[PDB]
Amino acid sequence: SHCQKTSLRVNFEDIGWDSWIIAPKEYEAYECKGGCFFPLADDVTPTKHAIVQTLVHLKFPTKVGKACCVPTKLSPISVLYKDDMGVPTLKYHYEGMSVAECGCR
Template sequence: CRRKKMYINFEDIHWNEWIVQPRGYQAYECVGQCHFPLNSHLTPTKYTAIKSLLHATYPRKIKPACCVPTKLQPISLLYYDDNNVLTYKFKYEEMMVAQCGCR
């Protein structure tokens, strides 16, 4: 389970209609598998540890833990708000994966 580069071009998702800058950004994504035993750098929860043990015992019945974002960071945006006012937001929250882990 690790962070991998993934570039988002706002034009591809039609957000260029309201976002002026940037035209895109490095959002990253989480890829890989979560195998038992889970390493501490993957920040597993107790639930995840238990689920991993159950998956190891019952692989056909219990799905494995998933590699997902565990920490997100903001990016800065220049955009048109709901009132069509040009707005600069220094911290547009939860836009970029900062850390991945098993959940």
């Protein structure tokens, strides 16, 4: 395939986070699916090392692997939860919960 952002809804009960997350119990986390195949275009914002390793992969595919398709930017969500001390906490921007951009690294 091709490294791209896909949809992914996460129910916290399924992962067991219902034990402390009061809301929203379920949200859109997104997912980076696909592979980083040569050539790496601009739309995955490749780094020089990612480009190097990819070129090495072409030369030595049995010894060196290709770049991985990972989230480049992450977006916050609104989360109401309980602290470790049980203190009710509401955070309008709970950073790093959903994928904003995907890329090759």
